[PDB]
Structures are given as structure tokens and as C-alpha cells.
A = this chain, B = another copy of it.
């Protein structure tokens, strides 16, 4: 017997929800039955009552149960995501994704256009000439032909639009900011997942563990929702349904310390210029961070196998990410991705 008064009442009492309550709430939102006030109340209360992995998993599962799927047998078993919660990072994630795909690891990303001038995943890709708004059959064909696909959230999650509007109206991060990485409709089993919210990274890791994903959930100790080069990073390594928390230092692999002012994401047009520069062989702090993050995604991919060893997996990941840039394979993959969109 579920209801808003009951569910919101329980959250304002600072109590974890009973099993299925988060799911009921998200289903109401997804079926268009929740008024904007109810959506907003739920998002704030869930946020101020620290969400648990069970609750966030319930929200993401309901969202996925409403999403358009990709066609049967079109997503490889070892596809990876590279994505962060933001709250930015999109330049790094996007470049790293292209590098990973160029290395031979299939990548399927998922995202929105940004509400600000600060680019979303989608905005930077469009600036580079990639057609981001394609239907399931064409994303599958992209993945097969180019090695990478992008699922536009507005297209694959049409029932989420009311929630999206509420989030923009309240304008501050909530539990819904966690769901991007957890609601990729291609359902990749691996990924490098950035989380800006240090206290919630462990929660996201828990959700991925329940799904038997091989993921590195990463939080830069300088706040970045990516593996940073300015200092150490905290990694929640997810494999075989378990989570190990680690401190990671890229200097151990010979990466120079950089400054934060050098790495943050900006608008889509500037992100686009930075992509072209890095993929064209420009050296410096941005390249290093892209390489490190690409390697991280390759390591997560390697973890799909029970016989993967941490330090050797990192060394291979770094070699592969560097080579994908240095040979021009990453630059050529982007060009082939642009051409894909222009040829139907």
C-alpha cells in the first residue's frame, strides 16, 4: 500500500525506505503520474536522507525497465562505458572514450545536452560533428562499424523528461545526479565511472557490484569525477560482486603532477578544440589525464576476466592508450565516427 505521504514521511523521518518503495516512487515519476512537487520533494528528501545502494539501484532499475533497449545481440559482452556524474569532466571522459574505442575496446556512452554553457557529453560530440541523436538500430550499427556508440538520454529515456525539468528548476545536485552512469540503456558490463560526490562513490560502487559489473568507480582526491593527475585518487574496484577501496597514485607510472586549472572541462566549443589538439598529438597535462583515464577503462574491461592482475593490467592499459593516440588511430576513429553520421 504505497503513497507519497508514506514514502516522503519516511524519508523526512531520516529512515531508509522499505524494499520496493524507491522503485514505486521512480515508477510513478516514469509513468507520468507524479506531479512536479512530488518529484521535487522525493529528490530532495532522498538526497538529504543519504541514499543507500539498494535505493539507488531501485531507481536505476525502474528507469532501465522503461528505457528503449538496443536490438538483441548488438552490444558486445565486453562493451565499456566511460562517464562521470559531473557536478566539469566531459572533456576528459569524451576523449578517453574515443581513445579506448580506438584501442579496440567497444564503447557505448550515454548522456544529455547540458543545461549550462558548460558542455554535457552530447554537446562536445555535436561540436565535433558527431550525430548524437540516433535510434537503437543506428547506435548498434555505429558500435559494430565505428567501434563506439552514443545513446542520447532524451531519446532512450523519453519518460524521464518530467524529472529532467524538475532537476533544472531546483538547480542543485540530488540523488538523480547519480543515475547517469547507472542507466546506460546498452547496459555495458564494464566501465570507468567518475563520481564527484566522495560520500556517494561507495554507494554507486555497491549498485555496480549487485549487477556483477567490472567497474572502477573513481574520485580524484582533489574533487574531480575522473582519475586526476594533480594528486592521488580513490578507486572503488568492483569485480565479482565485491568492492575493494584503494588509493591510487599516477606518479607510480611516471605521470607528472599537474594543476587543477589545467584539467577541468569548459564549454562544448572549447572542449571540441581540446579534443582535436589531444587527438592530434598535443602533449601536456590534458593528454596525460586522458591517457590515464583511458587506461583505467581498459583495466576495468580486463577485469571482466577472473585472471586479471592490477599492475600488469595498468601497464597494458597505458601502452594501449598511448599507442591509440600516437598512431593516429584515435584521431581516425573520430573522423570515421563523423563520416558514419553523414552516410545515413
Contacts and interface: CB of A to CB of B under 8 A. Distances in A.
Contact of A44 (B3, B41, B169): B41
A40 interface: yes
A8 B38 contact: no
A281 interface: no
Interface string A22-52: 0000000000000111111101110111000
A169 B14 CA distance: 20
In this complex, the member of A36, A170, A171 whose beta carbon has the largest number of chain B beta carbons within 10 angstroms is A170
A12 B49 contact: no
Contacts of A4: 169-172
Nearest to A9: B172
A5 interface: yes
A166 interface: yes
Contacts of A48: 11-12, 14, 44-45, 48-49
Interface of A: 3-5, 8-9, 11-12, 14, 35-41, 43-45, 47-49, 165-166, 169-174
Contacts of A165: 37
A171 B166 CA distance: 18
Nearest to A35: B169
B3 A41 contact: no
A169 B28 CA distance: 14
B3 A37 contact: no
A183 to B, nearest CB: 21
B169 A37 contact: yes
Contacts of A49: 48
Contacts of A9: 171-173
A8 B43 CA distance: 12
Contact of A169 (B38, B45, B172): B38
Nearest to A162: B37
Contacts of A47: 12
Given A4-B172, A41-B172, 4 more contacts: A4-B170, A8-B171, A12-B44, A37-B170
Contacts of A35: 36, 169
A173 B144 CA distance: 53
Contacts of A38: 40, 169-170
Nearest to A168: B37
A37 B172 contact: no
B44 A172 contact: no
A100 B91 CA distance: 70
Contacts of A45: 44, 48
Contacts of A14: 48
A197 to B, nearest CB: 11
A236 to B, nearest CB: 22
A323 B118 CA distance: 73
Contact of A37 (B8, B12, B40): B40
Return the 6 tightest CB-CB contacts between A and B, nearest first: A5-B171, A37-B40, A8-B172, A40-B40, A37-B169, A9-B172
A169 to B, nearest CB: 4
A14 to B, nearest CB: 7
A32 to B, nearest CB: 15
Contact of A8 (B3, B5, B11, B44): B44
A205 to B, nearest CB: 21
28 contacts: A3-B171, A4-B171, A8-B44, A8-B171, A8-B172, A9-B172, A9-B173, A12-B44, A12-B47, A12-B174, A14-B48, A35-B169, A36-B36, A36-B37, A37-B37, A37-B39, A37-B166, A37-B170, A38-B170, A41-B41, A41-B44, A41-B170, A41-B172, A44-B45, A44-B48, A45-B48, A48-B48, A48-B49
